[PDB]
Amino acid sequence: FSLRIDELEEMLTNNRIWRNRTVDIGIVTAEDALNYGFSGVMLRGSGIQWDLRK
């Protein structure tokens, strides 16, 4: 599986297409993002270093 997951990165992440499109869409990281409460990802994905796992 270790090689299989990194095959997606060589296909999607390094490409110009994703770095042109998905970059700068719905940038929400402020106290307002905390005022919506997404819990998993979003806040975890960007900003606050918080998780229930730890």
């Binding site: 599986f1 270790s2 090689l3 990194d6 095959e7 990165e9 390094n14």
Partner: protein, 69 residues
């Protein structure tokens, strides 16, 4: 004796490692081939255009040579 599920270690699969690595082209090397193909490209193309001139004058000569037409 009671038998259940057994554990296996050996190498532990090796989790989280960058498999992505740069191959073939480096940067400066591909530009030498790129401009090199261009320099070979224009030089070989214009030689046929000079060879076309041998035909070009000779083809239009047929109209000048033929006046009973």
């Amino acid at each position: 004796x009671x038998x259940x599920x057994x554990x296996x270690x050996x190498x532990x699969x090796x989790x989280x490692x960058x498999x992505x690595x740069x191959x073939x082209x480096x940067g400066y090397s591909m530009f030498a081939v790129g401009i090199g193909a261009l320099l070979f490209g224009y030089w070989s193309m214009m030689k046929w255009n000079r060879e076309r001139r041998r035909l070009q004058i000779e083809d239009f000569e047929a109209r000048i040579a033929l006046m009973p037409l």
